Design an enzyme around this catalytic site. Structure first.
Site, short mmCIF file in Angstrom:
data_model
loop_
_atom_site.label_atom_id
_atom_site.label_comp_id
_atom_site.label_asym_id
_atom_site.label_seq_id
_atom_site.Cartn_x
_atom_site.Cartn_y
_atom_site.Cartn_z
N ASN A 59 7.29 21.05 -38.48
CA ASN A 59 6.49 20.66 -37.33
C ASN A 59 6.03 19.24 -37.33
O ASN A 59 5.73 18.69 -38.37
CB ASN A 59 5.26 21.49 -37.18
CG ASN A 59 4.63 21.31 -35.83
OD1 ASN A 59 5.32 20.87 -34.85
ND2 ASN A 59 3.33 21.67 -35.72
N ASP A 74 8.24 22.54 -44.53
CA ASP A 74 7.46 23.27 -43.55
C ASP A 74 8.27 24.44 -42.91
O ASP A 74 8.86 25.26 -43.62
CB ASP A 74 6.90 22.26 -42.52
CG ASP A 74 5.67 22.79 -41.78
OD1 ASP A 74 4.80 23.35 -42.46
OD2 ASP A 74 5.56 22.66 -40.54
N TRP A 75 8.30 24.49 -41.58
CA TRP A 75 9.06 25.48 -40.85
C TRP A 75 10.57 25.28 -40.99
O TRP A 75 11.36 26.22 -40.76
CB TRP A 75 8.64 25.46 -39.41
CG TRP A 75 7.30 26.06 -39.18
CD1 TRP A 75 6.14 25.40 -39.01
CD2 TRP A 75 6.96 27.47 -39.11
NE1 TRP A 75 5.13 26.28 -38.79
CE2 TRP A 75 5.60 27.56 -38.87
CE3 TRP A 75 7.69 28.66 -39.23
CZ2 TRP A 75 4.94 28.77 -38.72
CZ3 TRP A 75 7.02 29.87 -39.10
CH2 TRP A 75 5.68 29.91 -38.85
N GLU A 122 6.10 22.43 -49.35
CA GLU A 122 5.08 22.69 -48.39
C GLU A 122 5.69 23.60 -47.37
O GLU A 122 5.73 23.28 -46.19
CB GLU A 122 4.55 21.39 -47.76
CG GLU A 122 3.83 20.47 -48.73
CD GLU A 122 2.36 20.72 -48.77
OE1 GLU A 122 1.79 20.88 -47.65
OE2 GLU A 122 1.77 20.75 -49.92
#
Length: 305
Positions: A50, A117-118, A141
Site C-alpha cells: 500500500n 506489505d500487501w 513488514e
C-alpha cells in the site's frame, strides 16, 4: 528526519524510473512494470504494497539483477498502471490482474517472490494456489497471519476503526492520508522532493483515483471486525506456509520497524526461514536499500546452487 548527504548524487526520479519501465495490456486494463530481462532461467518478482509502487524497489533491484531476472510491477490502479475495470481494488481484484499478467511474462516453472506489505499478501496467496510454482519467498513488514489481538502492534487500532468507517473516505480521498501522512512518517530519512513527488504523482488529484490506498487497509484480516473472505484467504495461506518445509524463505526484519515486532513471531512459524534485520520503519527500502539487496542477492544465490 534529514536528507542523506550523498542521495541526490544517485537519486532516480519518478520520470527516470518511468522511462525505464514498460507497459503490457492485462485483461481490460494494463500494468506498468520494470524488467531487468537478463538471466531469465529465473525470475524474481518484487511486489510493493500500500501507498507505493515499483519505484519503492529502485535501489534494491540493481543488486539482484546480475544473478536473476527481476520483474517489478505497478499494481493495478497504482504507479503508472491502468485502473481496475470495475473501479474495485480489493486483494482479489489485485490478484486477478496480477495472475493474468504473469501469464504474459514467460516465467520459469519455479518463481522467486519478494514482497512488502500487501505485496506479501498477494505473494502468499499466489503461492497457496500454485504450490508447484514457487522457488523461494522473501517478505518484510508483511501480512503473515490473521490478527487475534493488537498487543504487539503499534497504536493504529483507532486509525483502523476510522478507516473502516465513512471517515476513511475523508482521510484518503480528500486528504490522501497514506501518501501525505503515513508515508513520510514511516521513513527514517527525509525523501528528496523528486522522490516524494514520484509517490504523490499517481494520487495527486483528489477523489476516487486514491481508492486503492483506502481499499487495501479495509482488507485487514482482523478476526473480530475483518472482511471474512480476506480473513479466510490469509488463514488459508498461513497454514500452507506453516507446513511448507521445503520452501526456502527470507524474512527481512525492520528495526525498529513499524509492525516487524507484531509479525516476527508469526514469521517464525514458517519453517525454512532465514532471518536478517535492517534499519527502517515500514518502508525500509528507503532506509536500507543496499543492505537489503545484499541480503536478498545472497539468498537468491544460495537458492539457485
Amino acid at each position: 528526519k534529514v536528507y542523506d548527504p550523498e542521495q541526490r548524487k544517485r537519486m532516480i526520479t519518478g520520470p527516470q524510473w518511468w522511462a525505464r519501465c514498460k507497459q503490457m495490456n492485462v485483461l481490460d486494463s494494463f500494468i506498468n512494470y520494470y524488467d531487468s530481462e537478463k538471466h531469465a532461467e529465473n525470475a524474481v518478482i518484487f511486489l510493493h504494497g500500500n501507498a507505493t509502487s515499483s519505484y519503492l524497489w529502485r535501489h534494491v533491484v540493481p543488486h539482484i539483477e546480475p544473478v536473476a531476472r527481476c520483474i517489478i510491477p505497478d499494481l493495478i490502479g497504482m504507479g503508472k498502471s491502468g485502473k481496475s475495470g470495475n473501479g474495485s481494488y480489493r486483494l482479489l481484484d489485485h490478484y486477478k490482474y496480477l495472475t493474468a499478467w504473469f501469464e504474459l511474462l514467460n516465467l520459469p516453472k519455479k518463481i522467486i517472490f519478494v514482497g512488502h506489505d500487501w505485496g506479501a499478501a498477494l505473494a502468499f496467496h499466489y503461492a497457496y494456489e500454485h504450490q508447484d510454482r514457487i522457488k523461494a519467498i522473501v517478505h518484510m513488514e508483511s501480512v503473515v497471519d490473521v490478527i487475534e489481538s493488537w498487543d504487539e502492534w503499534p497504536d493504529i487500532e483507532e486509525d483502523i476503526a476510522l478507516i473502516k468507517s465513512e471517515e476513511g473516505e475523508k482521510m484518503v480521498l480528500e486528504n490522501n492520508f497514506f501518501v501525505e501522512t503515513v508515508l513520510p512518517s514511516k521513513i527514517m530519512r527525509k525523501l528528496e522532493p523528486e522522490e516524494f513527488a514520484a509517490y504523490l504523482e499517481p494520487f495527486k488529484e483528489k477523489g476516487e483515483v486514491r481508492r486503492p490506498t483506502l481499499s487495501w487497509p479495509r482488507e485487514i484480516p482482523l478476526v473480530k471486525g475483518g472482511k471474512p473472505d480476506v480473513v479466510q484467504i490469509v488463514r488459508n495461506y498461513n497454514a500452507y506456509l506453516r507446513a511448507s518445509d521445503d520452501l526456502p524463505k527470507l524474512f527481512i526484519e525492520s528495526d525498529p520497524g513499524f509492525f516487524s515486532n507484531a509479525i516476527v513471531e508469526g514469521a517464525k512459524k514458517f519453517p525454512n526461514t532465514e532471518f536478517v534485520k535492517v534499519k527502517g520503519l515500514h518502508f525500509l527500502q528507503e532506509d536500507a536499500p543496499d543492505e537489503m539487496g545484499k541480503y536478498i542477492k545472497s539468498f537468491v544465490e544460495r537458492v539457485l546452487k
